[PDB]
Write a protein that binds this ligand. Structure first.
Ligand SMILES: CCCC(=O)OC[C@H](COP(=O)(O)O[C@H]1[C@H](O)[C@@H](OP(=O)(O)O)[C@H](OP(=O)(O)O)[C@@H](OP(=O)(O)O)[C@H]1O)OC(O)CCC
Length: 98
Protein backbone atom coordinates (compact mmCIF):
# COMPACT_ATOMS: atom_id res chain seq x y z
CA UNK A 1 0.00 0.00 0.00
CA UNK A 2 1.69 3.18 -1.34
CA UNK A 3 5.26 1.78 -1.19
CA UNK A 4 7.00 4.77 0.42
CA UNK A 5 10.54 3.35 0.36
CA UNK A 6 11.91 1.54 -2.71
CA UNK A 7 15.37 0.58 -3.87
CA UNK A 8 17.68 -2.11 -5.16
CA UNK A 9 19.58 -3.59 -2.21
CA UNK A 10 22.04 -6.47 -1.86
CA UNK A 11 20.37 -9.00 0.46
CA UNK A 12 22.46 -11.58 2.31
CA UNK A 13 21.69 -15.21 1.54
CA UNK A 14 21.76 -17.88 4.26
CA UNK A 15 23.62 -20.17 1.87
CA UNK A 16 27.38 -19.95 1.71
CA UNK A 17 29.54 -17.36 3.43
CA UNK A 18 29.04 -13.64 2.69
CA UNK A 19 27.12 -14.09 -0.56
CA UNK A 20 24.68 -11.32 -1.45
CA UNK A 21 21.91 -11.18 -4.04
CA UNK A 22 20.43 -8.11 -5.72
CA UNK A 23 16.80 -7.75 -4.66
CA UNK A 24 14.37 -4.89 -5.27
CA UNK A 25 12.97 -4.12 -1.81
CA UNK A 26 9.96 -1.99 -0.86
CA UNK A 27 8.67 -0.70 2.47
CA UNK A 28 5.10 0.60 2.76
CA UNK A 29 4.97 1.03 6.54
CA UNK A 30 3.38 -2.38 7.20
CA UNK A 31 5.73 -4.98 5.68
CA UNK A 32 9.21 -5.16 4.17
CA UNK A 33 8.94 -6.93 0.80
CA UNK A 34 11.80 -7.96 -1.46
CA UNK A 35 11.44 -8.98 -5.11
CA UNK A 36 13.77 -10.62 -7.59
CA UNK A 37 12.97 -7.71 -9.90
CA UNK A 38 10.87 -4.57 -9.65
CA UNK A 39 8.89 -5.97 -12.60
CA UNK A 40 8.08 -9.20 -10.73
CA UNK A 41 4.43 -9.10 -9.55
CA UNK A 42 4.84 -11.35 -6.52
CA UNK A 43 7.56 -10.77 -3.91
CA UNK A 44 10.28 -13.28 -3.11
CA UNK A 45 9.67 -12.61 0.59
CA UNK A 46 7.57 -10.50 2.95
CA UNK A 47 8.66 -9.43 6.43
CA UNK A 48 5.74 -7.87 8.36
CA UNK A 49 6.59 -4.90 10.57
CA UNK A 50 4.79 -6.71 13.39
CA UNK A 51 7.35 -9.52 13.06
CA UNK A 52 10.24 -7.02 13.14
CA UNK A 53 11.82 -7.00 16.58
CA UNK A 54 14.75 -4.67 15.86
CA UNK A 55 16.65 -2.94 13.07
CA UNK A 56 20.26 -1.88 13.53
CA UNK A 57 23.05 -0.55 11.35
CA UNK A 58 26.15 -2.63 10.59
CA UNK A 59 29.86 -1.95 10.03
CA UNK A 60 29.75 -0.91 6.36
CA UNK A 61 26.71 0.51 4.53
CA UNK A 62 24.72 -2.46 5.84
CA UNK A 63 21.73 -2.91 8.13
CA UNK A 64 20.10 -5.84 9.93
CA UNK A 65 16.36 -6.43 10.21
CA UNK A 66 15.95 -8.80 13.16
CA UNK A 67 12.74 -10.75 13.73
CA UNK A 68 11.89 -13.36 16.34
CA UNK A 69 13.28 -16.20 14.22
CA UNK A 70 15.56 -14.76 11.52
CA UNK A 71 17.82 -11.81 10.76
CA UNK A 72 17.84 -10.23 7.30
CA UNK A 73 21.04 -8.48 6.21
CA UNK A 74 20.73 -5.79 3.53
CA UNK A 75 23.63 -3.90 1.95
CA UNK A 76 23.11 -0.46 0.43
CA UNK A 77 25.22 1.59 -2.00
CA UNK A 78 26.06 4.40 0.44
CA UNK A 79 25.98 5.10 4.16
CA UNK A 80 23.29 7.73 3.51
CA UNK A 81 21.00 5.13 1.92
CA UNK A 82 21.64 2.70 4.77
CA UNK A 83 20.89 5.41 7.34
CA UNK A 84 17.63 6.36 5.60
CA UNK A 85 16.47 2.73 5.46
CA UNK A 86 17.52 2.08 9.04
CA UNK A 87 15.94 5.26 10.46
CA UNK A 88 12.66 4.66 8.61
CA UNK A 89 12.34 1.11 9.94
CA UNK A 90 13.26 2.27 13.44
CA UNK A 91 10.70 5.08 13.27
CA UNK A 92 7.89 2.72 12.23
CA UNK A 93 8.97 0.17 14.84
CA UNK A 94 8.84 2.84 17.55
CA UNK A 95 5.35 4.03 16.55
CA UNK A 96 3.97 0.49 16.11
CA UNK A 97 4.72 -0.20 19.79
CA UNK A 98 2.71 2.87 20.89
C1 LIG B 1 30.33 -19.58 -0.99
C2 LIG B 1 29.35 -20.55 -1.63
C3 LIG B 1 28.40 -19.79 -2.55
C4 LIG B 1 26.97 -20.21 -2.30
O1 LIG B 1 26.73 -21.31 -1.85
O2 LIG B 1 25.97 -19.36 -2.57
C5 LIG B 1 24.80 -20.06 -2.89
C6 LIG B 1 23.84 -19.09 -3.57
C7 LIG B 1 22.47 -19.18 -2.91
O3 LIG B 1 21.63 -20.01 -3.67
P1 LIG B 1 20.05 -19.84 -3.41
O4 LIG B 1 19.49 -18.90 -4.42
O5 LIG B 1 19.33 -21.27 -3.55
O6 LIG B 1 19.82 -19.26 -1.92
C8 LIG B 1 18.50 -19.08 -1.49
C9 LIG B 1 18.12 -17.63 -1.76
O7 LIG B 1 19.10 -16.79 -1.21
C10 LIG B 1 16.75 -17.26 -1.18
O8 LIG B 1 16.62 -15.87 -1.14
P2 LIG B 1 15.63 -15.16 -2.21
O9 LIG B 1 16.18 -15.39 -3.56
O10 LIG B 1 15.59 -13.58 -1.91
O11 LIG B 1 14.14 -15.75 -2.09
C11 LIG B 1 16.59 -17.70 0.27
O12 LIG B 1 15.25 -17.57 0.61
P3 LIG B 1 14.94 -16.35 1.61
O13 LIG B 1 16.22 -15.81 2.12
O14 LIG B 1 14.06 -16.88 2.86
O15 LIG B 1 14.14 -15.20 0.80
C12 LIG B 1 17.02 -19.13 0.54
O16 LIG B 1 17.02 -19.25 1.94
P4 LIG B 1 16.12 -20.42 2.57
O17 LIG B 1 16.95 -21.80 2.42
O18 LIG B 1 14.83 -20.53 1.84
O19 LIG B 1 15.81 -20.12 4.13
C13 LIG B 1 18.41 -19.41 0.00
O20 LIG B 1 18.72 -20.77 0.20
O21 LIG B 1 23.74 -19.40 -4.94
C14 LIG B 1 23.81 -18.28 -5.67
O22 LIG B 1 22.86 -17.93 -6.33
C15 LIG B 1 25.08 -17.45 -5.67
C16 LIG B 1 26.11 -18.06 -6.61
C17 LIG B 1 27.37 -18.46 -5.83
Amino acid sequence: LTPLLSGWLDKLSPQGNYVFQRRFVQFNGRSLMYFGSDKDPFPKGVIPLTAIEMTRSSKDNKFQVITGQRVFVFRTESEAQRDMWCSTLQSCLKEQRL
